[PDB]
Design a protein around this nucleic acid. Structure first.
Ligand SMILES: [Mg+2]
Ligand SMILES: [Mg+2]
Ligand SMILES: [Mg+2]
Ligand SMILES: [Mg+2]
Ligand SMILES: [Mg+2]
Ligand SMILES: [Mg+2]
Ligand SMILES: [Mg+2]
Ligand SMILES: [Mg+2]
Ligand SMILES: [Mg+2]
Ligand SMILES: [Mg+2]
Ligand SMILES: [Mg+2]
Ligand SMILES: [Mg+2]
Ligand SMILES: [Mg+2]
Ligand SMILES: [Mg+2]
Ligand SMILES: [Mg+2]
Ligand SMILES: [Mg+2]
Ligand SMILES: [Zn+2]
Lengths: 224, 156, 211
RNA sequence: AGGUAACCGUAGGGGAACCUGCGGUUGGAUCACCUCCU
RNA sequence: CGGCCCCCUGGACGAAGACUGACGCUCAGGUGCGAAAGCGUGGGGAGCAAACAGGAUUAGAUACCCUGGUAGUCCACGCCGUAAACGAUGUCGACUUGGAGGUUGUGCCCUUGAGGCGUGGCUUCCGGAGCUAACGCGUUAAGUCGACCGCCUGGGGAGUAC
RNA sequence: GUAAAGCGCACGCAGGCGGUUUGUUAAGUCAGAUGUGAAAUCCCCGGGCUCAACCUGGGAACUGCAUCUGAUACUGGCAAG
């Protein structure tokens, strides 16, 4: 992504000067209208160097977890993961999604069992109310673990939108040593992101730019 | 090919509306005998469970210490939670001269010759809380050389 | 907090009866009296043959009793000569030409009777009850069960007070009628007294009624 | 308005438990047991 | 330490300079200050108020309540030298991410005005690393360090005896 | 800080400690030499009682002290900043 490509999308935009985090000073161009302005001169090379690492991970058969819980951007992140055959979390992050992997696997098994059971049959054997209740549970599990049913094991890389909002995920990752790739607004604490991208995390246009560029490079890394 | 050793088990209480409910806390370490070791501690309702689960956490957390030849590379102390532990390499064949709690830690890691001594309180979890940290804080004759940007004899 | 007999309520639903003959009132009381007496005689006899289930069904001109055990050859002895003599003693104690037949059990640690009685036997061996019931549940769940519960009551280890205890593992849904819950009871006569043992094994759900 | 005790220094009374006077401080409740090694 | 005014007088701070040239820090003994109560001498004396006088109440009330009321409380001059005299944190210096203030300075820019940028002093509250047994502390450290002094060594016996 | 333990506060003598540059000094300090530090003992290498204890050769050591000759970064002294 080129600085012009970002700027038109508005990547330079930031939170209010009232709400910023201390470690973000190096990445901040300045202030206008009491608004923090992010410096694309740092943003572009760091994003490119992160894309290099993401391409490397995906080119060694890496499993990638796209992470974002914004109600606006949930579907964008889900589609972003689907466009590169990867795994995602688009609904509220659940504590222990990575650290409590065994429980998630048991929940994955129940979701797999319910979908297999409906195809196999025995719903007719169940009472119509009972069969409907089983369908409701299957729908709820599909809404929740739709992205990670096929992750199989712990992912090899994480992509995070608004790292401050998803702080539990990054704490878990660091506790596991799983690398964190994150779009970091001025209000976030950048310590947990090993490849940090400072940029707007709310705006739909810039978020979609991040996701599309990452997914293009991930498909490229897969293709070899 | 790992190696494990229980350290201590305590029966802890928990007072409920009617009376109490005892439990059991195990504490153990796990090492590969090759300068790589971790420890675990987990409560449970009865001993074998605690001894089991605590044993498993210790299979994670296994740091890798850069010891040399069953002995450390330099004297080292480590203080955690009010417990102070001094250690230092010993001559060949000297053995593992250490208080009870530490001895296992030193053993499973791969140490063979080491002097040691504790100070302050001797709560077992504290001293291992206070020992592994001390262990990892060792420095190879090249970790320095690297971090000091020199050759090994350039320090030695 | 008293429960209800988990076998009884699941009768017809998933649990067939242990006696399937039919009769009118005129010949009813004595009918079950007879088959009770044969049950009692048998349970005295084959105590070493790991017998679990014993069902009496009486055709109009004959009676026939069937045995589910884990020690088939024991019951059969040789040439069923012990089986044949049992057939005789039952035919006379039932006063009707009998014909007994056995249908062994494959998972002896997976039915409630055999495990409960093994427990109570080891209890008479004065082995430690705790480790005993633990081995029981371990073998059970290990073998492929889905739930096991054991409960031992009364004067444990000879204690001068009745320390009733229990253990649970897996899944045992007691309020779900459609659930396959095998359940049984047995008893130990210690020097110090008598101690009760209850056992539940849950082999999962069945769908579609008794069929 | 929330509201209510302890304790310090000291003086007097008090048989002592203590109560009053002057000021100071927050350190502003009270307790606690039957089972037990892999 | 709290009306206002004057008279006498100590310290702090800021601004810019000029001068001095290490003149410093700490401090056993030593000296002084030192809340309240207390003591001496004399004065004063509304209010308040130990003691005390009564009323009541109470098993009884020696207490709690009321009515009183002396010393005291005040002044001068002595004396006493103790308090949970506490931030329960000795003094001085250097160093170590932040935010919210309060207060008192002062520079510049807003044309200045209302205001926006500076730069001090003191002070309050959060909270990072760090530290702590924990609670917590956290640029006014209980962090990282120096220098010097005071002090501690199970609890009672006892801050008592001599 | 709350477990025992910061004087109620301050001033201040004795005392302890002291920014920075040069010179000087050589006190501290360091280096070396020399003397001495009894023997036994302890330790090393031996030897002898059949072994051992024990006895014994030689050494090491006795970390000390004194003296002399050096060293000048440091601390002190002196002088000049
Ligand atoms: Mg009932
Ligand atoms: Mg009175
Ligand atoms: Mg007075
Ligand atoms: Mg007077
Ligand atoms: Mg009065
Ligand atoms: Mg005092
Ligand atoms: Mg005060
Ligand atoms: Mg003080
Ligand atoms: Mg005295
Ligand atoms: Mg004090
Ligand atoms: Mg002073
Ligand atoms: Mg001097
Ligand atoms: Mg000097
Ligand atoms: Mg000698
Ligand atoms: Mg010899
Ligand atoms: Mg000099
Ligand atoms: Zn944001």
């Amino acid at each position: 992504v080129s600085m012009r490509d970002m700027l038109k999308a508005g990547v330079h935009f930031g939170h209010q000067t009232r709400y910023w985090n201390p470690k973000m000073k190096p990445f901040i161009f300045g202030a206008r209208n009491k608004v923090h302005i992010i410096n694309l001169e740092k943003t572009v090379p760091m994003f490119n160097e992160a894309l290099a690492e993401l391409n490397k991970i995906a080119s060694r058969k890496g499993k990638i977890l796209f992470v974002g819980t914004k109600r606006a951007a949930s579907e964008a992140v889900k589609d972003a993961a689907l466009s590169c055959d990867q795994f995602f979390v688009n609904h509220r992050w659940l504590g222990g999604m990575l650290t409590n992997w065994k429980t998630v696997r048991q929940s994955i098994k129940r979701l797999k069992d319910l979908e297999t059971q409906s195809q196999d049959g025995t719903f007719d054997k169940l009472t119509k109310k009972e069969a409907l209740m089983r369908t409701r549970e299957l729908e709820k599990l599909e809404n929740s673990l739709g992205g990670i049913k096929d992750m199989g094991g712990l992912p090899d890389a994480l992509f995070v939108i608004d790292a401050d909002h998803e702080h539990i995920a990054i704490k878990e990752a660091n506790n596991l040593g799983i690398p964190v790739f994150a779009i970091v607004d001025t209000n976030s604490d950048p310590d947990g992101v090993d490849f940090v991208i400072p940029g707007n995390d709310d705006a739909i246009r810039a978020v979609t730019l991040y996701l599309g560029a990452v997914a293009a490079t991930v498909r490229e890394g897969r293709s070899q | 090919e790992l190696q494990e050793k229980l350290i201590a088990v305590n029966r802890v209480s928990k007072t409920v509306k009617g009376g109490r409910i005892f439990s059991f806390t195990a504490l153990t370490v796990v090492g590969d005998g090759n300068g790589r070791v971790g420890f675990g501690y987990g409560k449970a309702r009865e001993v074998p469970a605690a001894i089991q689960k605590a044993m498993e956490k210790a299979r994670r957390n296994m740091i890798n210490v850069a010891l040399n030849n069953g002995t450390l590379q330099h004297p080292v102390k480590g203080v955690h939670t009010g417990s102070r532990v001094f250690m230092q390499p010993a001559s060949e064949g000297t053995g593992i001269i250490a208080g009870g709690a530490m001895r296992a830690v030193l053993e499973v890691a791969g140490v063979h010759n080491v002097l040691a001594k504790a100070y302050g309180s001797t709560n077992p979890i504290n001293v291992v809380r206070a020992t592994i940290d001390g262990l990892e804080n060792m420095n190879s004759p090249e970790m320095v050389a690297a971090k000091r940007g020199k050759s090994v004899e350039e320090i030695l | 907090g008293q429960k209800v007999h988990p076998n009884g309520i699941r009768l017809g639903i998933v649990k067939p009866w242990n006696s399937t003959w039919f009769a009118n009132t005129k010949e009813f009381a004595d009918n079950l009296d007879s088959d009770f007496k044969v049950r009692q005689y048998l349970t005295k006899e084959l105590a070493k043959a790991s017998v679990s289930r014993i069902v009496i069904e009486r055709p109009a001109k004959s009676i026939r009793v069937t045995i589910h055990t884990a020690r088939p050859g024991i019951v059969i002895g040789k040439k069923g000569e012990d089986v044949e003599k049992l057939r005789k003693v039952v035919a006379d104690i039932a006063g009707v030409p009998a014909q007994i037949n056995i249908a062994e059990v494959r998972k002896p640690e997976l039915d409630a009777k055999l495990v409960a009685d093994s427990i109570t036997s080891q209890l008479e061996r004065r082995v430690m009850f705790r480790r005993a019931m633990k081995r029981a549940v371990q073998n059970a769940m290990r073998l492929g069960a889905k739930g096991i519960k054991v409960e031992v009551s009364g004067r444990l280890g000879g204690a001068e007070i009745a320390r009733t205890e229990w253990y649970r593992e897996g899944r045992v849904p007691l309020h779900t009628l459609r659930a396959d819950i095998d359940y049984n009871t047995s008893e130990a006569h210690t020097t110090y007294g008598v101690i009760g043992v209850k056992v539940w094994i849950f082999k999962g759900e069945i769908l579609g009624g008794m069929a």
